[PDB]
Design an enzyme around this catalytic site. Structure first.
Site, PDB file in Angstrom:
ATOM      1  CG  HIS A  41      -0.493   0.112   2.502  1.00 19.39           C
ATOM      2  ND1 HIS A  41      -0.388  -0.961   3.372  1.00 19.39           N
ATOM      3  CD2 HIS A  41      -0.171   1.227   3.207  1.00 19.39           C
ATOM      4  CE1 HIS A  41       0.057  -0.510   4.543  1.00 19.39           C
ATOM      5  NE2 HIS A  41       0.207   0.819   4.456  1.00 19.39           N
ATOM      6  CD  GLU A  72      -0.567  -4.476   1.765  1.00 19.89           C
ATOM      7  OE1 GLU A  72      -1.217  -5.042   0.815  1.00 19.89           O
ATOM      8  OE2 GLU A  72      -0.369  -3.212   1.835  1.00 19.89           O
ATOM      9  N   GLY A 146       1.201   5.668  11.014  1.00 19.73           N
ATOM     10  CA  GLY A 146       2.605   6.018  11.279  1.00 19.73           C
ATOM     11  C   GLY A 146       3.481   4.792  11.508  1.00 19.73           C
ATOM     12  CB  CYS A 148       2.282   1.033   7.631  1.00 19.59           C
ATOM     13  SG  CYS A 148       0.583   0.670   8.166  1.00 19.59           S
TER      14      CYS A 148
HETATM   15  C1  LIG Z   1      -5.580   2.581  11.686  1.00 17.32           C
HETATM   16  C2  LIG Z   1      -4.427   2.479  10.996  1.00 17.32           C
HETATM   17  N1  LIG Z   1      -3.457   1.603  11.469  1.00 17.32           N
HETATM   18  C3  LIG Z   1      -2.205   1.258  11.056  1.00 17.32           C
HETATM   19  N2  LIG Z   1      -1.678   0.391  11.875  1.00 17.32           N
HETATM   20  N3  LIG Z   1      -2.607   0.133  12.882  1.00 17.32           N
HETATM   21  C4  LIG Z   1      -3.683   0.868  12.627  1.00 17.32           C
HETATM   22  C5  LIG Z   1      -4.939   1.050  13.265  1.00 17.32           C
HETATM   23  N4  LIG Z   1      -5.863   1.867  12.824  1.00 17.32           N
END
Ligand SMILES: c1cn2cnnc2cn1
Length: 182
Positions: A41, A72, A146, A148
């Site tokens: 993504h 992913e 933030g 990922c």
């Molecule tokens: C929204 C976005 N996220 C990204 N990683 N965990 C979450 C939880 N909620």
């Protein structure tokens, strides 16, 4: 604080960069030579920023399993003047559950961030943002935007990269040794 955090810090300090795409800033794990991984993504294109330096992408491959299901994980080869420490011997060979994992993140927003996420479940199938996804690890921590690309380790193993959450659980894509054979 303890030996889990020790192994996570050792990976962060030598095998991560800050990757920027048009979809944001990501923690990016370097695996060997000029080869790194990022969540699919992130929408990697022909150019990416690596620690705020404009960098040509030599190859990008969005992995799918042999059922043609999203994993992913994008594998990126960077036109960078420096190699990563080879950490492929820290990758698991098979799908598995784990105890006592740490999620580590390093961005402009979240520098030097380490989270003891606890027990990691081989969750398998996840509908991730509407996309059927396989080889998902789950941990019971309220992860947020933030994080990922954050690295999921145990002592001695690099087991995944963070790809999503539902507010109460967090989800990682597995890293397997077989993704990085040459
Ligand atoms: C929204 C976005 N996220 C990204 N990683 N965990 C979450 C939880 N909620």
């Amino acid at each position: 604080m303890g030996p889990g955090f020790d192994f996570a810090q050792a990976i962060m300090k030598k095998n991560t960069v800050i990757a920027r795409t048009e979809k944001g800033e990501f923690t990016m794990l370097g695996v060997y030579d000029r080869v790194a991984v990022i969540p699919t993504h992130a929408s990697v294109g022909e150019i990416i920023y690596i620690n705020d330096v404009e960098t040509r992408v030599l190859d990008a491959c969005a992995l799918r399993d042999l059922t043609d299901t999203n994993l992913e994980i994008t594998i990126v080869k960077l036109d960078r003047n420096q190699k990563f420490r080879d950490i492929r011997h820290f990758l698991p060979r098979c799908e598995d559950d784990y105890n006592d994992a740490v999620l580590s993140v390093h961005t402009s927003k979240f520098p030097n961030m380490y989270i003891p996420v606890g027990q990691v479940t081989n969750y398998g199938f996840l509908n991730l943002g509407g996309t059927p996804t396989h080889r998902i690890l789950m941990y019971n921590f309220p992860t947020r935007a933030g994080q990922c690309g954050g690295v999921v380790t145990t002592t001695g193993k690099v087991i995944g990269i963070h790809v999503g959450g539902n507010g109460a659980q967090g989800f990682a894509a597995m890293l397997l040794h077989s993704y990085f054979t040459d």
